[PDB]
C-alpha cells in the first residue's frame, strides 16, 4: 500500500510521482480530470466503490458521461468555477447514485499540480 492520507495537505505532491499502478494502491478513491471534465487517471479503489472498470472509464466525460449524479451546480458547479480561476480544493460529502446502489462518500477535489488536470479523491462515510 502506497502511504498517503486522504485530505493531506501536501497530496498533489505526492501523487505527482504516482504512476497508474502506484495509484492503484491508495486506501481511497482517485481520478484525475482534465480541464474539460475527461478523465486521465482512475484507480482501482475508486472502481471498488462506484463499480466501473478503470481501464474502460479512461477518456470519458466524468460529468457527461460516466457520473450523472455530479452534474449538479454542488458538485460540477464547483469543478468548473475552479478550472476558470486556476484554483480549486474543496471537501464535501456526496452520495452516487446512478446505476449502483446509492452510496455515501467524501469527495475532495483539488487542483494537481501539473499544468491543467485536477484530482477528485473519493472515500467512504
Known sequence: M????????????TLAKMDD???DGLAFGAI??????????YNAAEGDITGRDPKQVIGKNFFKDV?????????????????????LNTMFEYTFD??????????????????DSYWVFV???
Open 2 to 13: 502506497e502511504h498517503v492520507a486522504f485530505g493531506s495537505e501536501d497530496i498533489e505532491n
Open 21 to 23: 499502478g502506484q495509484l
Open 32 to 41: 484525475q480530470l482534465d480541464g474539460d471534465g475527461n478523465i486521465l487517471q
Open 67 to 87: 457520473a450523472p449524479c455530479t452534474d449538479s451546480p454542488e458538485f460540477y458547479g464547483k469543478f468548473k468555477e475552479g478550472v476558470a480561476s486556476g484554483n
Open 98 to 115: 446512478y446505476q449502483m446502489t446509492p452510496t455515501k462518500v467524501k469527495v475532495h477535489m483539488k487542483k494537481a499540480l501539473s499544468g
Open 123 to 125: 472515500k467512504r462515510v
